[PDB]
């Protein structure tokens, strides 16, 4: 029945010949079947006949018509995957909108065509395609955010997008394989795989830029982390032929984040000594302004300063050789295991550092060839305490300011504030030095310290009051004694004693300037 089969075949060819789009996919499929059938319906019941197997002419025409048709299926398939041309996601991020997704009917088809091939033991190809296209697309979509991802943070949107994408990708793999819950992982692996590799490059690229200039991009590392974690929190569970690139990155980032503290404590020293002359006004050094501008920068990333506060003793951020005296830590009754206490300590150390170092440079300048006797209100060598005191206080009042105005306040809270306080007291204990002399000395000089003290006005009420009394509650008690005691040894009073304990008390009260 040679001419029989051939005559029927054409009917089909005249069908396939029409566009797949013009023959409800399902039908097109069926026909190709009935054909791959006739192909076999002639290679079985005629292979047995040695005196009959010669329908070679028409047979070949089938093998041909088939291959071609199947190929149009691969094509239709790819056409579908692309019915959602790549787009700029920058908008789906800002106005937090969902990404376009394949319509229902489309999935059906894809699934079908997937079935068509997987059901012919040659779907290992339709697989390669499915994966190829998707990733090529997502990749291109990402291409829009990339340029911005290099330095608001462009790294953020770049991630937000990836996460989003990783999501839609899971869905899609499942919505497509509701029949083959056997290779869902391997498939989604190949799709996400490159997406990540891209993330990784871009990611590593940023760190490279951050490791470079820590002075300004330093804090970005905290963001780099939030980013890499979120990406890792999204992948959790699914397999990834390429995961090590993330475990690597976190290693790189994390390894830059604590580097920030030993570093932070350094800028402060390398910036306090930066200049060796006491400003004309005894005022706020650019250093003081820098360290705060920087500390504050820290506070803005609380959650991140803790995440990378573990496995780090505070030795990890102090000079290799540091004097315990130069700090305000004492009441070691803190649960050093708890990060918060650490973080607070850190901050308090920076402040302490800044304060001490200014005092270093301060003493050096005013009187060199004399080994700087820092942080010691009773220095016998130091003779410019008062000024130095005023000087350091003047910056602290600024330090205090930036603190109260920010997170740094909540971070120090309590212990921090207690140290800060203890610190202020150190330098006020300073300005009062000159008076302890005058007093104990005798047991003119008075007018002297009065004049001198009138030269320093403080931008803070507390200090003024504190200093007023501090002086009073030291000179007076003492003077009254000596006064009234060795007072009457002669006769005429106001003809020798130009000053009366009562008078002095008033004079001292005029020191509100």
How far is it between the farthest Cα atoms of the chain? Answer: 160
Task: Supply the Cα-derived Rg of the chain in whole angstroms.
Answer: 41
Distances from the Cα of 9 to the Cα of 20, 62, 73, 120, 213, angstroms: 17, 8, 19, 21, 73
- 202, 231 Cβ separation under 8 angstroms: no
How many other CB atoms sit within 10 Å of the CB of residue 260? 20
What value, to the nearest 5°, has the Cα angle with vertex 102 and ends 97 and 106?
A: 160
Q: What is the DSSP letter of 401?
A: H
Can you give the residue range of the structural domain that contains 145? 1-513
Q: Within a 13 Å sphere around the CA of 22, how many CA atoms are in the beta-carbon half?
A: 6
How many other CB atoms sit within 10 Å of the CB of residue 135? 18
Q: Which residues contact 254 (CB under 8 A, 6 or more apart)?
A: 225, 308
**Elucidated via:** X-ray
| Residue among 302, 298, 205 nearest 249 (CA) | 205
Q: Using CA atoms, how far apart are residues 274 and 358, in angstroms rounded to an integer?
A: 10
Q: Using CA atoms, how far apart are residues 330 and 243, in angstroms rounded to an integer?
A: 47
Domain count of the fold of the chain? 1
469-491 in b/e burial notation, b at 16+ Cβ within 10 A? ebbbebbbebbbeebeeeeeeee
- 435, 474 Cβ separation under 8 angstroms: yes
How many other CB atoms sit within 10 Å of the CB of residue 331? 10
Can you read off the two tokens belonging to residue 454? 């009138």
- Alpha helices per DSSP H over 300-381: 302-307, 339-366
Q: Using CA atoms, how far apart are residues 162 and 195, in angstroms rounded to an integer?
A: 8
- 374, 356 Cβ separation under 8 angstroms: yes
Can you read off the two tokens belonging to residue 406? 């920010």
Q: Using CA atoms, how far apart are residues 372 and 362, in angstroms rounded to an integer?
A: 9
Q: What is the DSSP letter of 490?
A: S
| Residue among 448, 331, 461 nearest 393 (CA) | 461
Q: Using CA atoms, how far apart are residues 221 and 257, in angstroms rounded to an integer?
A: 6
Can you read off the two tokens belonging to residue 420? 């800060």
Instruction: Region of 171 please: left (phi>0), alpha (psi -120 to 50) or beta.
Output: alpha
| Residue among 36, 43, 38 nearest 69 (CA) | 36
Q: Using CA atoms, how far apart are residues 149 and 203, in angstroms rounded to an integer?
A: 9
Q: Using CA atoms, how far apart are residues 357 and 392, in angstroms rounded to an integer?
A: 10
CATH number of the CATH domain containing 210: 1.20.1280.170
Q: Which residues contact 142 (CB under 8 A, 6 or more apart)?
A: 89, 158, 161, 162, 165, 195, 198
Tell whether the torsion through CA atoms of 353, 359, 365 and 370 is positive or negative: negative
| Residue among 15, 175, 42 nearest 105 (CA) | 175
- 274, 358 Cβ separation under 8 angstroms: no
Q: Using CA atoms, how far apart are residues 259 and 264, in angstroms rounded to an integer?
A: 9
Q: Using CA atoms, how far apart are residues 285 and 135, in angstroms rounded to an integer?
A: 55
Q: Using CA atoms, how far apart are residues 225 and 218, in angstroms rounded to an integer?
A: 12
Q: Which residues contact 463 (CB under 8 A, 6 or more apart)?
A: 393, 397, 424, 428
Tell me which residue has tokens 């068509």: 116
Q: Using CA atoms, how far apart are residues 425 and 429, in angstroms rounded to an integer?
A: 6
Can you read off the two tokens belonging to residue 305? 């300063």
Tell me which residue has tokens 């951050």: 210
- Resolution given for this structure, in angstroms: 3.5
Q: Using CA atoms, how far apart are residues 99 and 89, in angstroms rounded to an integer?
A: 8
Q: Using CA atoms, how far apart are residues 494 and 283, in angstroms rounded to an integer?
A: 42
- Alpha helices per DSSP H over 273-338: 286-299, 302-307
What value, to the nearest 5°, has the Cα angle with vertex 499 and ends 496 and 504?
A: 170
Q: Using CA atoms, how far apart are residues 208 and 195, in angstroms rounded to an integer?
A: 20
């Amino acid at each position: 029945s040679v001419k029989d089969l051939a005559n029927e075949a054409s009917k089909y060819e005249i069908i396939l010949q029409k566009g797949i789009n013009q023959v409800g996919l399902k039908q097109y499929t069926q026909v190709v079947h009935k054909l791959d059938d006739m192909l076999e319906d002639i290679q079985s019941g005629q292979a047995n006949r040695e005196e009959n197997s010669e329908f070679h002419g028409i047979l070949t025409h089938l093998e041909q018509l088939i291959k071609r048709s199947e190929a149009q299926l691969r094509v239709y398939f790819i056409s579908i995957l692309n019915s959602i041309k790549p787009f700029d996601p920058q908008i789906n991020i800002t106005k937090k909108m969902p990404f376009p997704y394949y319509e229902d009917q489309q999935l059906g088809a894809l699934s079908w065509i997937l079935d068509y091939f997987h059901g012919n033991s040659e779907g290992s190809i339709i697989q390669d395609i499915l994966v190829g296209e998707r990733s090529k697309l997502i990749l291109k979509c990402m291409a829009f955010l990339e340029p911005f991802a290099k330095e608001s943070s462009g790294m953020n949107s770049y991630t937000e997008a990836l996460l989003g994408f990783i999501a839609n990708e899971k869905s899609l793999v499942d919505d497509l394989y509701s029949q083959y819950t056997e290779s869902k992982p391997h498939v989604l692996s190949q799709i996400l795989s490159p997406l990540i590799s891209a993330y990784a490059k871009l990611f590593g690229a940023n760190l490279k830029i951050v490791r470079s200039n820590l002075e300004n991009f330093g804090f970005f590392s905290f963001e780099l982390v939030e980013s890499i974690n979120d990406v890792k929190k999204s992948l959790r569970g699914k397999e990834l032929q390429n995961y090590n690139l993330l475990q690597d990155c976190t290693q790189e980032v994390r390894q830059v984040t604590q580097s920030l503290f030993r570093d932070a404590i350094d800028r402060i020293i390398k910036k306090a000594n930066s200049i060796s002359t006491i400003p004309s006004n005894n005022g706020v050094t650019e250093a003081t302004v820098d360290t705060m501008s920087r500390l504050r920068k820290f506070s803005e990333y609380k959650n991140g300063c803790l995440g990378a506060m573990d496995n780090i003793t505070r030795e990890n951020w102090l000079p290799s050789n540091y004097k315990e005296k130069e700090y305000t830590l004492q009441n070691e009754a803190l649960n050093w295991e708890d990060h918060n206490v650490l973080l607070s300590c850190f901050i308090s150390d920076c402040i302490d550092t800044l304060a001490v170092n200014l005092e270093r440079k301060a003493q050096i300048a005013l009187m060199p060839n004399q080994e700087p006797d820092v942080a010691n209100p009773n220095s016998s060598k130091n003779k410019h305490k008062q000024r130095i005191g005023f000087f350091i206080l003047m910056n602290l009042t600024l330090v205090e300011q930036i603190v109260e105005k920010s997170e740094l306040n909540l971070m120090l809270a309590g212990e921090g504030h207690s140290r800060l306080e203890r610190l202020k007291k150190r330098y006020i204990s300073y300005m009062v030095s000159d008076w302890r002399d005058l007093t104990a000395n005798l047991m003119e000089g008075f007018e002297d310290l009065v004049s001198k003290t009138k030269q320093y006005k403080l931008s803070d009420p507390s200090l003024k009051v504190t200093l007023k009394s501090e002086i009073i509650s030291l000179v007076m008690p003492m003077y009254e004694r000596f006064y009234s005691r060795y007072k009457d040894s002669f006769k005429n009073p106001r003809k020798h004693i130009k000053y009366t304990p009562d008078e002095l008390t008033t004079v001292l009260n005029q020191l509100v300037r």
